[PDB]
Structure 1
Amino acid sequence: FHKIRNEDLIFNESLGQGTFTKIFKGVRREVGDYGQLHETEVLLKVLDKAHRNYSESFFEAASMMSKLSHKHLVLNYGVCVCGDENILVQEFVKFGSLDTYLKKNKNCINILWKLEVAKQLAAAMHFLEENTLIHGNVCAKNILLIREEDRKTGNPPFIKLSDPGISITVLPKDILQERIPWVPPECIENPKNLNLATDKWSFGTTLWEICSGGDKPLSALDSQRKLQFYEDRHQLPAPKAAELANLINNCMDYEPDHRPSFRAIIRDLNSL
């Protein structure tokens, strides 16, 4: 990663927190193309100082994905590791995370919008699959909305997939249990079962979110009941708008080897 000086970063409003991270809107002063000076809006992801031992994991996966440029993968500008901070400096996406957007626009998002966002997410995951790169945390909060749909000019929405964050292969077991049903059953049994197949399961969970107006699946279940949900081999309920329900269940297959490739997933989406 390119190293950015703390002096060139200005922290502004908080935009929430993640797993052992805090999120801020920021500005980066930089020299851009042709030597022009810019003050660029950025998203700053700050690793909690108390959790400095997770720094390697947060940055590694972000790094490996940033070695692969793709239109549906978020741009990272660099890192700031001056002083006692570990900061990821990322492109600022105008409309933020998709989960909050789905809730705030539920009475405006139709099946064609969902199918377009689903196709774009599958395209990003196919790219990752072909590069044998595991994401490990596909969820609606990690889908960033670059552009809204514009029925006036026929423009579809446009999304990017955000960075993975700290790997589930190093997180505490109680955090992994809280992330059921995004974390697949095999990874609850053994976090070292993290595999390409993991992302197919979480992709299914993410489609469920996209179809459910921002609801979080199994949110009414505490961690103990989420564990028993997997032990009893339950599936998620079909969303009210159930057009993607079969694909969701096909992806959320308790047998990891049976989950369809993203090429097949894309073919399925294109048939709807």
Structure 2
Amino acid sequence: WEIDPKDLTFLKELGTGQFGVVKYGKWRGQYDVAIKMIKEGSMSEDEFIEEAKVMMNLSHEKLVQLYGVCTKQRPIFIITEYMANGCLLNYLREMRHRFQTQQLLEMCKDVCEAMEYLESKQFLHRDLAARNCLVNDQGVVKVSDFGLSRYVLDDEYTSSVGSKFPVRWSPPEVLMYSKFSSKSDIWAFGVLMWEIYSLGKMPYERFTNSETAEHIAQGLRLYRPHLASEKVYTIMYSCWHEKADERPTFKILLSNILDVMDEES
């Protein structure tokens, strides 16, 4: 579980997030890694460390791999697989890629495989969104930072009325009662498909968080991105049923996405 930080060589800053700075570097002079330098006061560290033992065992080709942690001194480090093309959201926003719809659906499949694996292990992501997926040098999309939301100390992130809370990715039962389940990840995944087909537009871009919560409680939904076929829109919409138990599983979504790939090759 433990990595010796002296085996790390730091090379470039990648960005700053909920837990502070993240860097790109090498492990033992040779292996690409991303290193989260956890900003003091920003994480429930003891709980996270206990949980990292479980997370180490979540291994899937479409999940960013946790390699280990450096706990001896602070800041603590989280060491992970490095993704050369950065976050899916910024990748979608670079219009130069001029992705074909088949590539867009492959991105959704990549995420849906990861989530189906997590669902099979009864492990929630809790903050699924394009900003929390990453792209490797082969253009493969992987799911990042699953479950880490549980260790954030910042009330602006955790409170449902907080400035940083993922309101636009949340189902009504989440906004109304904090009922979190595999079905809240499903809802978020549909929003994520919408992000992908919308090339990274903000969901409900003309509404505030408050306005979004009220409209989805009334039954308003996102609508079809121009790049989504009717079949693709159907899949994303299915994630948004008002009743959580009527939303599909990731296993079902996966077969649906595979069928659509077969029908719109």
Q: Normalising to structure 2: TM-score of the pair?
A: 0.85
Kindly provide the amino acid, as one letter, of the partner of residue 167 in structure 1.
R
In the alignment, what sits opposite 1:71?
61
CA contact (8 A) 1:146 1:158 kept: yes
Structure 1 unaligned blocks of 5 or more: 30-37, 149-156
How far apart are the structure 2 equivalents of 1:107 and 1:158? 14
Q: Tell me, yes or no, if structure 1 residue 82 matches structure 2 residue 72.
A: yes
Residue correspondences, number: 253
Structure 2 unaligned blocks of 5 or more: 261-265
Instruction: Provide Cα deviations, 1:190-210, integer angstroms capped at 9, x if missing partner.
Output: 33x221111111110110011
Q: How does 1:115-154 map to 2 (within 5 A)?
A: 115-148=105-138
CA contact (8 A) 2:193 2:236 kept: yes
Is the partner of 1:25 in helix, strand or coil? strand
In the alignment, what sits opposite 2:142?
160
1:259 to 222, 247, 252: 247
Q: Tell me, yes or no, if structure 1 residue 212 matches structure 2 residue 202.
A: no
In the alignment, what sits opposite 2:212?
226
How far apart are the structure 2 equivalents of 1:102 and 1:138? 16
Shift of 1:111: 0.8
Q: How does 1:28-39 map to 2 (within 5 A)?
A: 28-29=27-28, 38-39=29-30
CA contact (8 A) 1:147 1:159 kept: no
In the alignment, what sits opposite 2:189?
203
Shift of 1:226: 2.5
Shift of 1:235: 0.5
CA contact (8 A) 1:124 1:161 kept: yes
Range that drifts further, 226-235 or 195-204: 226-235
Residues 14 and 57 of structure 1: CA distance in aligned 2, closer, same or farther (over 3 Å): farther
Residues 254 and 198 of structure 1: CA distance in aligned 2, closer, same or farther (over 3 Å): same
Identity %: 26
Q: Normalising to structure 1: TM-score of the pair?
A: 0.83
How far apart are the structure 2 equivalents of 1:81 and 1:168? 15
Instruction: Provide Cα deviations, 1:118-174, integer angstroms capped at 9, x if missing partner.
Output: 1222122222222222121211122221243xxxxxxxx422211222229972334
